[PDB]
Swiss-Prot record, chain B:
The chain holds residues 20 to 160 of 174 of the full protein. The lineage of its organism: Eukaryota, Metazoa, Chordata, Craniata, Vertebrata. The gene is DNPH1. Expressed at low levels in brain, colon, lung, peripheral blood leukocytes, placenta, small intestine, and thymus. Expressed at high levels in heart, kidney, liver, skeletal muscle and spleen. Overexpressed in a significant proportion of breast cancers. This is 5-hydroxymethyl-dUMP N-hydrolase. Optimum pH is 6-7 at 37 degrees Celsius. 5-hydroxymethyl-dUMP binds at residues 9, 11-13, 70, 72, 76, 100.
């Protein structure tokens, strides 16, 4: 099965816990979600090494980029250098030009969305 | 041959402090060329990303102010690690914040370092790092 990596900001996880769970639940239909048991409220070297191992194992990286995060950005930077296929999900805040600009319409895509249509978008992405 | 220094910080940290980022850049100029000294941060996006990536590849050292969360700063740090760059992260714990485990965990005490500091001592720390 394809290996899927999900990540999001700690702030996005706090205010929108259900949103991250909805994304992960939908991703499970298209493969194994390596980060599905991550409980964001979490020495640091062990976390970094496990994160890198999952990033290297992933076939697709799905990042929720609505809130600023050094961790999400760092994971995206490592993922680009690991030549991974990336999908960023943004809820229109101004998305960083480093993320919007990394998009190439194929291997790195950034999709603007409204909370309610996240399942439909994920279906479209993985049925293509 | 002057060393090429790359500086980056969050847009929030640039707004809430302004003088802090300018103090850091001014001090870095003593030790080398600052590739990002003329960055406004009031910013098509692809051109910005490609210019950023060119500066990252040219750098000898990357200095990042990591006090406020930022997708851009994190992304630049991730690309910098993969480009095998020497990195120094500057974090202010007085802000009450806890630095991301992805950044604190990337530290190895040598090639990637994270230093906790108080606003007033930033010039002294930069002098120590660059061996003044
Ligand atoms: C102030 N910020 C931080 C402070 C402390 C720690 C991290 C951060 C930080 O920068 N973060 C938080 C973590 C986030 N990455 C992330 N978030 C999720 C994630 C959120 C989430 C929510 C719901 C569900 C479901 N169902 C699944 C979820 N999966 N996965 N990943 C990737 C794995 C990395 C973790 C390594 C694990 C090592 C270990 O198991 O010991 C990036 C931003
Ligand atoms: C919501 N956030 C964003 C929204 C929109 C755009 C970016 C962000 C974002 O994530 N950012 C902001 C930019 C930041 N990086 C950064 N900040 C500085 C920087 C701040 C600063 C302050 C004072 C002084 C002095 N003296 C010098 C300074 N140099 N350099 N860099 C690296 C160069 C990248 C520029 C590419 C240009 C492309 C082009 O010209 O074609 C990362 C976080
Ligand atoms: Cl976060």
């Amino acid at each position: 099965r394809p290996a899927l990596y999900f990540c999001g900001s700690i702030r996005g996880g706090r205010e929108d816990r259900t949103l991250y769970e909805r994304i992960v639940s939908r991703l499970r239909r298209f493969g194994t979600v390596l980060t599905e048991h991550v409980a964001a409220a979490e020495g640091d070297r062990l976390i970094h090494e496990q994160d890198l191992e999952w990033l290297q194992q992933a076939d697709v990286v799905v990042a929720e980029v609505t809130q600023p995060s050094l961790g999400v950005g760092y994971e995206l930077g490592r993922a680009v250098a690991f030549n991974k296929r990336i999908l960023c999900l943004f809820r229109p805040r101004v998305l960083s030009a480093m993320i919007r600009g990394a998009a190439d319409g194929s291997r790195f895509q950034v999709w603007d969305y409204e909370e309610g249509e996240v399942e439909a978008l994920l279906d479209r992405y993985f049925e293509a």
